[PDB]
Design an enzyme around this catalytic site. Structure first.
Site, mmCIF file in Angstrom:
data_model
loop_
_atom_site.group_PDB
_atom_site.id
_atom_site.type_symbol
_atom_site.label_atom_id
_atom_site.label_comp_id
_atom_site.label_asym_id
_atom_site.label_seq_id
_atom_site.Cartn_x
_atom_site.Cartn_y
_atom_site.Cartn_z
ATOM 1 C CG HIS B 65 92.227 114.624 36.681
ATOM 2 N ND1 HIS B 65 93.077 113.668 37.204
ATOM 3 C CD2 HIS B 65 92.941 115.780 36.627
ATOM 4 C CE1 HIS B 65 94.257 114.219 37.446
ATOM 5 N NE2 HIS B 65 94.204 115.498 37.101
ATOM 6 C CE1 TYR B 132 91.533 105.495 39.126
ATOM 7 C CE2 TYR B 132 89.832 106.674 37.937
ATOM 8 C CZ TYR B 132 91.163 106.394 38.151
ATOM 9 O OH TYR B 132 92.108 107.034 37.386
#
Lengths: 177, 171
Positions: B65, B132
């Site tokens: 992604h 993240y």
């Protein structure tokens, strides 16, 4: 979709409980712990969340009780389970030296916002835990020697911890004697 | 609060960030990010605004992604993952090259991906927690098949557990 339910504590004014939505499936779970857009309004204008910190501890480790005049903390557990305890260390507060416990498990994601002059502490009730927290403050980071410490088992506070024999840091032992 | 910062040898503009950690018998404490230190790794005006966690079981593979806009700072805070960064910058001389980092919560390391990079990871431990941060200008996309032969990623399995999205890119 990124949502947060935000609720003030019923017993410690200025302490907020933040519940994110989570997407769950066979692969596992995804969730957003923080957005600036949504959660920067939890602290006054000009103060930003600027530090992200992790503490990986074993069962029966107890960290605390720590605070200072400057640092807002947004705390949670992203793996395992902890008994998070917030202590009111504000001398002008009607709940001075009272406390509130949140059992935070990575399965039931919840973040606690502590304003400054509050005692942060947690106990690891799972085999292992990963504690995540964000720090917001003006100016320089407030180092350990400049923070205050209360003994985990201070009788004035009277925290109900699941054990009488926690594993303690030298700092957190020192406050005991 | 220190960070060792090293550019990738293979993918220009990808950085490997190693924080100092305090370790003892009680466990390990470390700072994953400071604005003071790590905001200078991205252009002016671009700020880290989102913190995200992905908790996955063994054999789950997420990716590949990316998007045009989002800088990502990625790590594993529990367990172990094979993190793979793909260069999806069509103007880059290393377009579709990749680099693997085996990131273990015991050996704390964060990877900074600029925009138009492919993010992916495979969970090699029983469970993992992937952390993240996302930085971008303004308000809060593309997919490559995990096993795309043009990329040729070396994954430890041929039979990962995949999302419908990540399966769709396969066919």
């Amino acid at each position: 979709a990124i949502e947060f339910d935000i609720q003030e504590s019923k017993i410690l004014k200025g302490v907020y409980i933040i519940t994110p939505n989570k997407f769950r499936d066979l692969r596992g779970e995804i969730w957003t712990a923080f957005t600036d857009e949504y959660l920067s309004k939890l602290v006054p204008d000009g103060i930003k969340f600027k530090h992200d910190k992790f503490i990986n501890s074993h069962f029966n480790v107890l960290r605390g009780i720590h605070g200072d005049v400057k640092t807002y903390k947004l705390v949670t557990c992203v793996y395992g389970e902890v008994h998070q305890v917030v202590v009111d260390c504000r001398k002008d507060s009607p709940t001075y030296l009272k406390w509130e416990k949140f059992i935070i498990s990575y399965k039931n994601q919840q973040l606690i916002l502590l304003p400054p002059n509050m005692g942060n502490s947690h106990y690891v009730s799972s085999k292992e835990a990963v504690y995540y927290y964000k720090l917001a403050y003006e100016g320089e980071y407030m180092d350990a020697p400049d923070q205050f410490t209360y003994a985990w088992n201070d009788e004035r506070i009277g925290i109900d911890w699941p054990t009488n024999t926690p594993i303690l840091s030298d700092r957190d032992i020192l406050a005991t004697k």
